[PDB]
Amino acid sequence: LHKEPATLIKAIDGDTVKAMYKGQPMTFRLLLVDTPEFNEKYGPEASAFTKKMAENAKKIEVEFDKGQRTDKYGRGLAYAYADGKMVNEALVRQGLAKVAYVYKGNNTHEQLLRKAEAQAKKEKLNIWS
Ligand SMILES: Cc1cn([C@H]2C[C@H](OP(=O)(O)O)[C@@H](COP(=O)(O)O)O2)c(=O)[nH]c1=O
Numbered sequence: 083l084h085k086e087p088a089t090l091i092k093a094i095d096g097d098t099v100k101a102m103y104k105g106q107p108m109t110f111r112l113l114l115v116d117t118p119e120f121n122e123k124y125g126p127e128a129s130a131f132t133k134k135m136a137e138n139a140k141k142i143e144v145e146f147d148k149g150q151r152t153d154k155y156g157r158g159l160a161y162a163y164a165d166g167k168m169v170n171e172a173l174v175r176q177g178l179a180k181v182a183y184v185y186k187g188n189n190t191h192e193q194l195l196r197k198a199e200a201q202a203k204k205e206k207l208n209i210w211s
């Protein structure tokens with residue numbers, strides 16, 4: 083996999099951000115995770131975490147996997163990085179997202195994220211408290 087440039091337009095919720103990619107606005111849905119909806123417990127916290135991470139970065143980058151690049155809703159499916167740090171991983175590490183939607187063919191960073199989730203669950207963080 084390789085990182086590609088994108089510029090942040092808006093953080094939307096815990097697991098979706100709008101960003102300019104190859105010069106067009108795209109809503110990206112983070113691969114391999116599921117944050118609560120904003121209306122659910124830890125939703126506002128997941129939203130705030132992704133908003134702070136993305137907005138504070140000097141650069142954002144997106145990294146597509148080997149399989150589907152867009153979902154049925156037209157959303158880009160990617161791993162997003164904020165100054166080299168993966169947002170998908172950070173959310174899971176903080177107990178603000180569960181590893182989810184792991185589809186064969188589009189699961190390159192599955193084990194990285196499952197390692198993170200085990201550690202969040204150990205520390206009983208947020209969703210795991
Ligand atoms: C993360 C991810 C979500 N999706 C789809 C499956 C779910 O469809 P259904 O909407 O029919 O439930 C939906 C979940 O997104 P949200 O968690 O943003 O709702 O997005 C994918 O198709 N591929 C993916 O890699």
Ligand SMILES: [Ca+2]
Pocket residue numbers: 097116117118119
């Ligand atoms: Ca969600």
